[PDB]
C-alpha cells in the first residue's frame, strides 16, 4: 500500500512526492486529478497525469465533455485511471487566477468523501492560485475518508508540515 507518509490526522496523510510517480508505484483504487471544468489537462497535476497516460486521459475526457458538458467548479466526475489507478476522480477546485469563489474549495473536497481511500494533490494549490496551507486545512476539516496527499514541492511540503495545526 502507501509508504513514507506522515500522518496529519486520523484520516489525512501527506508525503513529498510526485503524484504521477506515486500513482505508478501504488496503482491506487483512486487517483484525484486537479481538473478544470472542461477536463483540459494542459498543465500542473492534470498535464502531468495526462502525459503519463500517453494522452489517453485527454481522449477519454474529451468524449466525456462531448456527451455531458462541462463540470461545475466544486464538482467531479469518475473516469478511468488508465495506467495510474483503477479510477481517476477529476475534481474541480476553484481557480483563484480566474476569480473563482475560494469558498467552493470545501465543496470540491466533499467529492473525496464518496471514496474510501484516495491518492490526491492539494486542491486549488499550484497553478490554481490558492494558498496551499488553506487547502490543507479545508482538506483535513472536510474529508472523512482516507486521503494520501502527494505534495510535489519539498519546500512547500516542509512549510505545510511545520505550520500544520
Ligand atoms: C471506512 C469508513 O468508515 N469511512 C468513514 C466514513 C464512512 C462511515 C461508514 C460507512 C462508510 C463510510 C466515510 C464517509 O463519511 C462518514 C464516515
**Which residue owns the Cα nearest ligand 1 atom 13?**
145
Contact at 8 Å (CB) between 123 and 143?
no
Spans of all domains in the chain: 1-165
Method for structure elucidation = X-ray
Give the whole-angstrom CA distance, residue 131 versus residue 148: 19
The DSSP code for 48 is H
C-alpha 49/C-alpha 34 separation (Å) is: 9
Q: In testing the pocket of ligand 1, which one of 113, 116, 118 has its CB within 8 Å of the most ligand atoms?
A: 116
Sequence-ordered list of residues with C-beta below 8 angstroms from that of 100, at least 6 positions apart, any chain: 73, 94
Q: Cβ(80) to ligand 1 under 6 A?
A: no
Task: Determine which residue's CA is closest to atom 11 belonging to ligand 1.
Answer: 116
Is the C-beta atom of 113 inside 6 A of ligand 1?
yes
Amino acid at each position: 500500500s502507501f509508504s513514507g507518509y506522515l500522518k496529519l490526522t486520523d484520516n489525512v496523510y501527506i508525503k513529498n512526492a510526485d503524484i504521477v510517480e506515486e500513482a505508478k508505484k501504488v496503482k491506487p483504487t483512486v487517483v484525484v486529478n486537479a481538473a478544470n471544468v472542461y477536463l483540459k489537462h494542459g498543465g500542473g497535476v492534470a498535464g502531468a497525469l495526462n502525459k503519463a497516460t500517453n494522452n489517453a486521459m485527454q481522449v477519454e475526457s474529451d468524449d466525456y465533455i462531448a456527451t455531458n458538458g462541462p463540470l461545475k467548479v466544486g464538482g467531479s466526475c469518475v473516469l478511468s485511471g488508465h495506467n495510474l489507478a483503477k479510477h481517476c476522480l477529476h475534481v474541480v477546485g476553484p481557480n483563484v487566477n480566474k476569480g473563482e469563489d475560494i469558498q467552493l474549495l470545501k465543496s470540491a473536497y466533499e467529492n473525496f468523501n464518496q471514496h474510501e481511500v484516495l491518492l490526491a494533490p492539494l486542491l486549488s494549490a499550484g497553478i490554481f492560485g490558492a494558498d496551499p496551507i488553506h487547502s490543507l486545512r479545508v482538506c483535513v476539516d472536510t474529508v472523512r475518508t482516507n486521503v494520501y496527499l502527494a505534495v510535489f514541492d519539498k519546500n512547500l511540503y516542509d512549510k505545510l508540515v511545520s505550520s500544520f495545526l
